[PDB]
Design a protein around this ligand. Structure first.
Ligand SMILES: [Ca+2]
Length: 122
């Protein structure tokens, strides 16, 4: 099958998210899902998570979706914002502007052998 790649997403951090924020991320690609921990009381959080999505369909299986949530203990959490990317092969630094502030992360996408092209369709 064409369009297949290894996808690893990392180096998650956010800026100016507010007035106190308790942020965590949910990160999706196709049917797969990761969730980070909560950084309590911080408008510029960083998370150490490395998210290996292993083999994915880079073309059709997307998008890569990052949700930035504010944990509210004893109530419903607040969705601060969300962004989508259609990943391309290589190494990429993403900046997602939110209504307030932004979230940043990197990803590496490498086509499976005998595939090439920016979305591994060739
Ligand atoms: Ca809650």
């Amino acid at each position: 099958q064409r369009g297949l790649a290894h996808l690893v997403v990392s180096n998650f951090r956010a800026e100016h998210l507010a007035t106190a924020t308790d942020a965590y991320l949910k990160v999706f690609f196709g049917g797969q899902e990761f969730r980070t921990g909560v950084v309590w009381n911080n408008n510029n959080p960083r998370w150490t998570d490395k998210m290996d999505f292993e083999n994915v369909l880079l073309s059709t299986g997307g998008p890569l979706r990052v949700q930035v949530w504010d944990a509210d203990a004893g109530a419903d959490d607040d969705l601060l914002g969300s962004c989508d990317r259609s990943p391309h092969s290589g190494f990429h630094e993403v900046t997602c502007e939110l209504n307030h502030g932004r979230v940043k992360f990197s990803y590496h996408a490498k086509c499976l052998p005998h595939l090439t092209g920016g979305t591994c369709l060739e």
